[PDB]
Amino acid sequence: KLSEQLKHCNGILKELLSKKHAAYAWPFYKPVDASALGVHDYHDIIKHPMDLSTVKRKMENRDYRDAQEFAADVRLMFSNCYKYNPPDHDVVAMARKLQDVFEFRYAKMPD
Numbered sequence: 001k002l003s004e005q006l007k008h009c010n011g012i013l014k015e016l017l018s019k020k021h022a023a024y025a026w027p028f029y030k031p032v033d034a035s036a037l038g039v040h041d042y043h044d045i046i047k048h049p050m051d052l053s054t055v056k057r058k059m060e061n062r063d064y065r066d067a068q069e070f071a072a073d074v075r076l077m078f079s080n081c082y083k084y085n086p087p088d089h090d091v092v093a094m095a096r097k098l099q100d101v102f103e104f105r106y107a108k109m110p111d
């Protein structure tokens with residue numbers, strides 16, 4: 001049984017995965033497939049891949065012991081995107097928008 005704070009985190013996660021945000025969330029649904037995408041330098045540049053399916057698995061498996069650990073993974077996901085891609089690329093604009101959704105709701109965390 002998740003703590004109250006981790007319940008809030010799980011709610012955020014469900015929201016990020018919902019159809020409401022799909023237009024900009026979809027690149028983050030699954031691990032980057034570097035070979036499929038032709039980005040053969042991705043794993044040289046990104047040492048700690050992260051994506052929402054992995055966050056979801058970790059939540060289901062009770063891997064996260066607190067909200068801070070959850071938030072660090074979601075933010076790592078966005079950071080990888082900002083690290084690999086030029087700041088004016090489409091996928092970066094999507095990341096910024098999804099991160100806005102995440103940060104404003106994470107800020108509503110019950111004490």
Ligand SMILES: COC(=O)[C@H](C)[C@@H]1N=C(c2ccc(Cl)cc2)c2ccc(OC)cc2-n2c(C)nnc21
Nearest residue numbers: 026027028030031032033037039081084085090091
């Ligand atoms: C050539 O650069 C790319 O393809 C990067 C690696 C890729 N761009 C994208 C990307 C490029 C253009 C648009 Cl409009 C949306 C996403 C990408 C696409 C699919 C995907 O999972 C299936 C992950 C993507 N992703 C993420 C997350 N962070 N960077 C990307």
Ligand SMILES: C[C@H](O)COC[C@H](C)O
Nearest residue numbers: 096097099100101103104
């Ligand atoms: C767009 C920045 O990379 C992240 O900003 C988060 C803010 C809550 O929109």
Ligand SMILES: [Cl-]
Nearest residue numbers: 068071072075
């Ligand atoms: Cl953090």
